[PDB]
GROMACS .gro file of C-alpha atoms in nm:
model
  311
    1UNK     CA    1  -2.056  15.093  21.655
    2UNK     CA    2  -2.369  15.079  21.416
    3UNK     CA    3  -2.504  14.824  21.223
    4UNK     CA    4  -2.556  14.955  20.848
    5UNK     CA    5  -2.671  14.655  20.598
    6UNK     CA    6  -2.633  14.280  20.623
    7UNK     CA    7  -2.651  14.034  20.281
    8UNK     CA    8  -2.671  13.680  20.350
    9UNK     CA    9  -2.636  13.459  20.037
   10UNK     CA   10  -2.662  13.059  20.091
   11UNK     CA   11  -2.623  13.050  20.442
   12UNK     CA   12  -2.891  12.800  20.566
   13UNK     CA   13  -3.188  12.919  20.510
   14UNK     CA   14  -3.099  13.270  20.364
   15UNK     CA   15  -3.066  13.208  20.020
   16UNK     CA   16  -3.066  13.594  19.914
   17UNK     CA   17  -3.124  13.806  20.226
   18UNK     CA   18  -3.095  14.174  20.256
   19UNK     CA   19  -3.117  14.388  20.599
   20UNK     CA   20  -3.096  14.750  20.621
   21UNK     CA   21  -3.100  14.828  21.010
   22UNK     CA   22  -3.168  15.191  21.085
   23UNK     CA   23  -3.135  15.433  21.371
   24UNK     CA   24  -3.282  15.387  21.684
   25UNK     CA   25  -3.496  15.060  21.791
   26UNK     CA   26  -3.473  14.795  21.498
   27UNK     CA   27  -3.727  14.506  21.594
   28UNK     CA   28  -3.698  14.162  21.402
   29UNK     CA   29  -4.018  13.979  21.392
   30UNK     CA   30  -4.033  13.620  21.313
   31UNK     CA   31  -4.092  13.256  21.409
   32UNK     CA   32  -3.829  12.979  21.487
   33UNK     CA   33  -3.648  12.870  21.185
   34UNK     CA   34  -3.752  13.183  20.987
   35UNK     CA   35  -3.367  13.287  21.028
   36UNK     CA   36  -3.328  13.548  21.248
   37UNK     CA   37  -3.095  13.310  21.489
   38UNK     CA   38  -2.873  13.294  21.160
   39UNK     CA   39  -2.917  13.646  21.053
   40UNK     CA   40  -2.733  13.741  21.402
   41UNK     CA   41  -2.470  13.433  21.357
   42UNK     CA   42  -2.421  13.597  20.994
   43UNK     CA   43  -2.335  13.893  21.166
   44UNK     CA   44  -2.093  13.740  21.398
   45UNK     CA   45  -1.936  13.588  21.118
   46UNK     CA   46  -1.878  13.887  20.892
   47UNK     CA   47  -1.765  14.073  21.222
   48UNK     CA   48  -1.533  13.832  21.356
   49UNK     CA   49  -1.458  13.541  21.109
   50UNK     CA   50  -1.280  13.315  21.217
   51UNK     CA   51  -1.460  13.149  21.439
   52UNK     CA   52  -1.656  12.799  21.514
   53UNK     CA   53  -2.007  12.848  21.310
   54UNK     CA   54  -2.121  12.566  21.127
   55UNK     CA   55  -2.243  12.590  20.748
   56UNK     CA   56  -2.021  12.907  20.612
   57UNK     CA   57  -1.683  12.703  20.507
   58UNK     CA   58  -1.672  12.409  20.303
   59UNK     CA   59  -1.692  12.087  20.442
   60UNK     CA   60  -2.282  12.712  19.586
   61UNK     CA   61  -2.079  12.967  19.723
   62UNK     CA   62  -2.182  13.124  20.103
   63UNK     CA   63  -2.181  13.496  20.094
   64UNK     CA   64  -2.167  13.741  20.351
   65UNK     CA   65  -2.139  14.108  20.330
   66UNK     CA   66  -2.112  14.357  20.620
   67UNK     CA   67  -2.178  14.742  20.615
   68UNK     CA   68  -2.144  14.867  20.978
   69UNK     CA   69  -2.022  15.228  21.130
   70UNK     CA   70  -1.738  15.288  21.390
   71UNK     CA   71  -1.618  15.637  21.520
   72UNK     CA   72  -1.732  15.813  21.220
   73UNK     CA   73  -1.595  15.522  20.909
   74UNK     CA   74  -1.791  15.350  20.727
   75UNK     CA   75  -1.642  15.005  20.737
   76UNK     CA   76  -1.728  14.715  20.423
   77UNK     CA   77  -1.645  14.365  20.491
   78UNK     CA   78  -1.718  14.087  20.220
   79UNK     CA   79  -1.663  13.713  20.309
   80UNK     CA   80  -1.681  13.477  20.031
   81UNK     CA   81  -1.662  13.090  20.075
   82UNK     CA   82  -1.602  12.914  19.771
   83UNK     CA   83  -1.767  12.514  19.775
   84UNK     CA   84  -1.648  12.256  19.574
   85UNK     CA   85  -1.277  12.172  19.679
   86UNK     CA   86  -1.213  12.349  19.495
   87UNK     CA   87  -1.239  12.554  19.851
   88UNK     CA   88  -1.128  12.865  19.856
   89UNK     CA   89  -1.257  13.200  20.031
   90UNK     CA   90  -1.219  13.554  19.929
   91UNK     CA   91  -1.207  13.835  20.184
   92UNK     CA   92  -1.175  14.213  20.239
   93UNK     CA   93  -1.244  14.465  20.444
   94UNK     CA   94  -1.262  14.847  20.306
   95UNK     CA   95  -1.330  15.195  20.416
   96UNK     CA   96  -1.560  15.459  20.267
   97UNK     CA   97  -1.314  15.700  20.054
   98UNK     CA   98  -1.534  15.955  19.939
   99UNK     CA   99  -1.785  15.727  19.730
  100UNK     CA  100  -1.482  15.463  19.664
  101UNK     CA  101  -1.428  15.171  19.882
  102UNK     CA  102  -1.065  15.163  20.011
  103UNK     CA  103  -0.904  14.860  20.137
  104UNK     CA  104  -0.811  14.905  20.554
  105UNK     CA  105  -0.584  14.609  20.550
  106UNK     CA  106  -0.442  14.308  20.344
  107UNK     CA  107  -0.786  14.140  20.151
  108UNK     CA  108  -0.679  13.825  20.380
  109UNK     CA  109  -0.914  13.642  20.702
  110UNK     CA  110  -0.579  13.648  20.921
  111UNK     CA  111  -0.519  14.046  20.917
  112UNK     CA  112  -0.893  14.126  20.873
  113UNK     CA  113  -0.943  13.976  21.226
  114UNK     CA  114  -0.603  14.101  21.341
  115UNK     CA  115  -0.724  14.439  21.187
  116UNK     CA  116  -1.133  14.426  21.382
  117UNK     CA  117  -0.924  14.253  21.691
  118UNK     CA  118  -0.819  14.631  21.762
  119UNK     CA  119  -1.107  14.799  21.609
  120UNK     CA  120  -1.387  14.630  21.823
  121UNK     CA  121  -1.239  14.361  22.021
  122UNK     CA  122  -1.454  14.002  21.977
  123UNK     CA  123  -1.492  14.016  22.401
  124UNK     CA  124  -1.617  14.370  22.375
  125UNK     CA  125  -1.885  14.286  22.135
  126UNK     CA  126  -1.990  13.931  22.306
  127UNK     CA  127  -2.000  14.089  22.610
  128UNK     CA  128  -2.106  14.441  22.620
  129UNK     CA  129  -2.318  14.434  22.288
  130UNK     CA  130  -2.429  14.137  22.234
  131UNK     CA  131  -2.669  14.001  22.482
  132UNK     CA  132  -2.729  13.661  22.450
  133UNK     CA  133  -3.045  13.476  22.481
  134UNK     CA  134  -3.089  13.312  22.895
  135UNK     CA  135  -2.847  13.579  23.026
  136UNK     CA  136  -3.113  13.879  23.193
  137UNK     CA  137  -3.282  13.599  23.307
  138UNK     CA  138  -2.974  13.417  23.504
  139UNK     CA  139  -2.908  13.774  23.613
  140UNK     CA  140  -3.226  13.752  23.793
  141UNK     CA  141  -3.278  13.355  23.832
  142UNK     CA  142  -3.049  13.331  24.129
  143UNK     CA  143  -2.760  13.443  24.288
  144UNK     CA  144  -2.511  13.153  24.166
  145UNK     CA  145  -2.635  13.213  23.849
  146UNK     CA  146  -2.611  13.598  23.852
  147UNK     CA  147  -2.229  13.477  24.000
  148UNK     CA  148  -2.188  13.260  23.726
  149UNK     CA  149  -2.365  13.553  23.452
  150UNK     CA  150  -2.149  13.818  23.637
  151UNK     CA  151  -1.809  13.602  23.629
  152UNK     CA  152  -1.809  13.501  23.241
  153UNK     CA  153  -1.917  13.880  23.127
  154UNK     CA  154  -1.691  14.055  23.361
  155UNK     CA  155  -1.366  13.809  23.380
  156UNK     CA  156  -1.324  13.849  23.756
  157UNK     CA  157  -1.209  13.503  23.911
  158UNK     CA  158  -1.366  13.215  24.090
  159UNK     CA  159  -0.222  13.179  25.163
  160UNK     CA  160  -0.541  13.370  25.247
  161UNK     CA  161  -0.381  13.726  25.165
  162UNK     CA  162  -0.431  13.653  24.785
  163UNK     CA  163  -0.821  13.532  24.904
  164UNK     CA  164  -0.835  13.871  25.068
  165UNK     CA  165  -0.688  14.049  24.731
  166UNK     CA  166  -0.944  13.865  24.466
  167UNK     CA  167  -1.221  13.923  24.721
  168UNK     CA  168  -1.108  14.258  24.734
  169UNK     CA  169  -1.074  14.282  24.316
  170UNK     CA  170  -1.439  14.147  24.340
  171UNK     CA  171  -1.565  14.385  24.585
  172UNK     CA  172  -1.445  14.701  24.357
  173UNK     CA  173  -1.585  14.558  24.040
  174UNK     CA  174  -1.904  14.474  24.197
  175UNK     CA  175  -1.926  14.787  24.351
  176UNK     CA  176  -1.883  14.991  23.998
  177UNK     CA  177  -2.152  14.785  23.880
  178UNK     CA  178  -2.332  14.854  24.178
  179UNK     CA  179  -2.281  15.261  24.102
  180UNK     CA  180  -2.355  15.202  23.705
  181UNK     CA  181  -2.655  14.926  23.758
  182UNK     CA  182  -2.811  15.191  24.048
  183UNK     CA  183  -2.807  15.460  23.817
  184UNK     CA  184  -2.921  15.300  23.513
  185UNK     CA  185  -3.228  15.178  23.753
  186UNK     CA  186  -3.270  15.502  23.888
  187UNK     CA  187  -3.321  15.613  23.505
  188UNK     CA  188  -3.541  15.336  23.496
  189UNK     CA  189  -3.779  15.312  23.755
  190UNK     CA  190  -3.870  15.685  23.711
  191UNK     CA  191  -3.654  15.768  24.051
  192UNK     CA  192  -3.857  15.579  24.307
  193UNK     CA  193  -3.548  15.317  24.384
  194UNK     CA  194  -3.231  15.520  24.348
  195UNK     CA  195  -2.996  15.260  24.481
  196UNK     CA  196  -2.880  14.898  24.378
  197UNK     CA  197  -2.656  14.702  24.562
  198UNK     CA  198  -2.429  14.414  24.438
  199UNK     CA  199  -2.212  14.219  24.685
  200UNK     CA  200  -2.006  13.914  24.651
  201UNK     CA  201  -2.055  13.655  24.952
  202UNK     CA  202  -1.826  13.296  24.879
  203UNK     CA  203  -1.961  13.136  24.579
  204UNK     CA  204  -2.279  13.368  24.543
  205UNK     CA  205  -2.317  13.746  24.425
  206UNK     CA  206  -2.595  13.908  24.629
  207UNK     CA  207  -2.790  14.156  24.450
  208UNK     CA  208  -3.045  14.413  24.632
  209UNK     CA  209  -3.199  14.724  24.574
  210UNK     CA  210  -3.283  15.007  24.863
  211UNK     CA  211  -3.599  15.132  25.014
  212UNK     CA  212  -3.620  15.325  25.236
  213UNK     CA  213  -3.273  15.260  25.348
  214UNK     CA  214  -3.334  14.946  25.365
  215UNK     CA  215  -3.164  14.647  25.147
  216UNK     CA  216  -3.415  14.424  24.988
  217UNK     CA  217  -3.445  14.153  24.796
  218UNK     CA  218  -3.566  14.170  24.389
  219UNK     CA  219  -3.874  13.930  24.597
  220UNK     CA  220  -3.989  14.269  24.715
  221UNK     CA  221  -4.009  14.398  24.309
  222UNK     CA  222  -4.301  14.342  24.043
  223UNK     CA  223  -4.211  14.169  23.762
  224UNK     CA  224  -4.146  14.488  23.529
  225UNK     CA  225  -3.926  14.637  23.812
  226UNK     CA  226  -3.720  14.289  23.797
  227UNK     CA  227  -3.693  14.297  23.449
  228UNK     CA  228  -3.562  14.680  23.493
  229UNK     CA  229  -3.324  14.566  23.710
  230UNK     CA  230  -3.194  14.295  23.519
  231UNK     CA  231  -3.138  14.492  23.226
  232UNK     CA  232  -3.038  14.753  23.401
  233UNK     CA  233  -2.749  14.517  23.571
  234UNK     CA  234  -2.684  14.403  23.234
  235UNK     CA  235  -2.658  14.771  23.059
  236UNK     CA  236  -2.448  14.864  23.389
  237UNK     CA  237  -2.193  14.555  23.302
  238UNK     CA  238  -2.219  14.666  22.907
  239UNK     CA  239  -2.080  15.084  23.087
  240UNK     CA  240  -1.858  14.869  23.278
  241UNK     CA  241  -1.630  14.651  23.020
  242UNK     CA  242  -1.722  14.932  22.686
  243UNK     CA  243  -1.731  15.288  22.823
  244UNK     CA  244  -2.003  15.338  22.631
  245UNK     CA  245  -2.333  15.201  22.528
  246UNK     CA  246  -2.383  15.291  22.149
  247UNK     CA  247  -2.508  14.984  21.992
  248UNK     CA  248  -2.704  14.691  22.173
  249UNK     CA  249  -2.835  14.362  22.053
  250UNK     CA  250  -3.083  14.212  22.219
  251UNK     CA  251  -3.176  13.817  22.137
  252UNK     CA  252  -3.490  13.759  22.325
  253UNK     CA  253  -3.449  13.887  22.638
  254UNK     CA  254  -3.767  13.853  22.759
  255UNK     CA  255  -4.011  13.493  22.762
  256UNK     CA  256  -4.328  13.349  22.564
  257UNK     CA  257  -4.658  13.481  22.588
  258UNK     CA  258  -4.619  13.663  22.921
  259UNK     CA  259  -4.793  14.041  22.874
  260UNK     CA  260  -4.728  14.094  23.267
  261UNK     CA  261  -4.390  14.251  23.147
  262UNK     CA  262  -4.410  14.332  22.812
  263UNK     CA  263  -4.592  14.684  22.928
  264UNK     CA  264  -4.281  14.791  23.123
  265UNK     CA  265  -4.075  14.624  22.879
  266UNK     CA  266  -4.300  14.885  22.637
  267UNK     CA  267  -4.238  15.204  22.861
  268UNK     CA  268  -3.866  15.141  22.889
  269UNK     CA  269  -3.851  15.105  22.516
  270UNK     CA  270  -3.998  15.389  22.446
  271UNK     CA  271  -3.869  15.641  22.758
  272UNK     CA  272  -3.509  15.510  22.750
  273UNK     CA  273  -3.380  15.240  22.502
  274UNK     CA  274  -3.439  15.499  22.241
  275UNK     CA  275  -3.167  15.691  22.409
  276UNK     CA  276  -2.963  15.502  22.271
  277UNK     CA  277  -2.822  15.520  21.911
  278UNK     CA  278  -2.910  15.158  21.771
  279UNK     CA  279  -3.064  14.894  21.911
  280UNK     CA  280  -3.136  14.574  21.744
  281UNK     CA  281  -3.423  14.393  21.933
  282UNK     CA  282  -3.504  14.001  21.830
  283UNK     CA  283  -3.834  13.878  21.943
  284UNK     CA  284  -4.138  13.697  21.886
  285UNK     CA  285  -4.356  13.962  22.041
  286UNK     CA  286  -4.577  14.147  21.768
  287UNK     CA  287  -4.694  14.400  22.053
  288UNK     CA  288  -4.349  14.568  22.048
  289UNK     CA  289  -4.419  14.685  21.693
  290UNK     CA  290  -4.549  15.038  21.818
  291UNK     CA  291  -4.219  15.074  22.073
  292UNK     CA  292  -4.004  15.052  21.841
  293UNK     CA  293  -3.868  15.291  21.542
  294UNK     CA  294  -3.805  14.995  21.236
  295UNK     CA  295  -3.958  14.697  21.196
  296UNK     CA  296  -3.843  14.417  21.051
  297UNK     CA  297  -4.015  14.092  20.984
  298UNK     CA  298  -3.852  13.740  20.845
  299UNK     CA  299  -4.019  13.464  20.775
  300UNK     CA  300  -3.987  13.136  20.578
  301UNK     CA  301  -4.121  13.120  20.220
  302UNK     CA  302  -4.083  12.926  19.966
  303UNK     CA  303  -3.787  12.763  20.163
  304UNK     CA  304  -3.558  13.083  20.232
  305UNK     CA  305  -3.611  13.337  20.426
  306UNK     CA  306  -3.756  13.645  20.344
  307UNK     CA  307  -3.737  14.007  20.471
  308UNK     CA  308  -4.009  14.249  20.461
  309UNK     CA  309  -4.003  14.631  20.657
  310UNK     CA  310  -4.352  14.611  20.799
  311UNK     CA  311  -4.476  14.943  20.808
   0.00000   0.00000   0.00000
């Protein structure tokens, strides 16, 4: 999947909003409120509408149109929601014919999600695309809340035979990670830890990485190295549900005002992240500017957000 153009029309505080997202590292730049939160819901709603977002239906006319890229297809979807009840809304999704958009299914909200259900399932995207804002962080908080992280983005599960089975089920998914996460860390941390180990004890999911032959804890780790880890745990469960890691969102994944990180955060953007063939990064950081390959910057005039390529 890659992200082509987004146009927001009168969708909070987009009033006309165009994005064109490129290859490689996109950075958005902005403040709180400026509307880069809603930029990404906007996205989530012209992928995968319907769903619960408040402010697109009725209850002038919100606009949303989506160019994105899947296995080689340009794909087009236009939402329209009329307001006035009159309440109507006008949809379609269509393919690039030559220099003709095609329609891929009925212009109707019911078959265009039945339709992207099969071309990039909603869990797919949630889970191994989209990382959420809080979620790197649980991965590295604790280990009930890397169980609880690990549990909601890989399904798993929360007489003693079928105890033995899950824990078993757990085990081998845990393990995979284990392989994928090690690997990704190992790519990471410039081959100095080459091992990461993820184990499932009751209610808690240890997680350690070798030395030496050793198991440690992430205690024994400098900040950047935890932050590797995490995202490499998190990249490791993105190989694990997609296959594949093509495009990546990611919505703040690090904190406020803390440059500690934001150097190795810096290397890995620039040594590995831009291995990958789009990633969109949302932060607040202006440092990153240099680390990555577009730059985007919205902020709030004159009441609506604007959008301006810095650079």
């Amino acid at each position: 999947m890659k992200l082509e153009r987004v146009t927001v029309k009168n969708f909070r505080s987009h009033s006309d909003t165009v994005v064109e997202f490129k290859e490689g590292i996109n950075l958005i730049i902005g403040q709180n409120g400026s509307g880069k939160s809603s930029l990404l819901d906007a996205i989530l709603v012209g992928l995968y509408w319907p769903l619960r977002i408040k402010d697109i239906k009725k209850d002038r006319d919100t606009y949303i149109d989506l160019i994105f890229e899947k296995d080689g297809t340009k794909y087009r979807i236009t939402r329209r929601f009329l307001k006035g009840y009159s309440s109507g809304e006008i949809h379609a999704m269509k393919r690039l014919v030559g220099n003709e958009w095609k329609h891929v299914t009925e212009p109707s909200s019911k078959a265009i999600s039945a339709f992207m259900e099969k071309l990039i399932p909603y869990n797919i995207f949630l889970n191994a695309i989209y990382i959420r804002q809080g979620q790197i962080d649980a991965i590295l908080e604790s280990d009930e809340a890397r169980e609880k992280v690990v549990r909601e983005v890989l399904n798993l599960d929360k007489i003693e035979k079928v105890k033995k089975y899950k824990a078993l089920a757990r085990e081998a998914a845990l393990s995979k990670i284990g392989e994928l996460a090690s690997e990704i860390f190992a790519e990471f941390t410039e081959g100095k830890y080459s091992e990461v180990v993820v184990r499932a004890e009751e209610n808690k999911v240890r997680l350690f990485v070798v030395w030496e032959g050793k198991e440690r804890p992430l205690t024994f780790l400098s900040g950047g190295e935890r932050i590797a880890l995490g995202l490499a745990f998190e990249l490791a469960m993105s190989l694990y549900l997609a296959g594949e890691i093509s495009l990546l969102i990611l919505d703040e994944p690090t904190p406020y005002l803390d440059e500690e990180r934001r150097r190795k955060l810096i290397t890995i953007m620039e040594r590995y992240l831009k291995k990958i063939p789009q990633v969109i990064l949302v932060s607040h950081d202006e440092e990153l500017k240099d680390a990555a390959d577009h730059v985007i910057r919205i902020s709030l005039e004159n009441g609506s957000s604007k959008v301006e390529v810095v650079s």
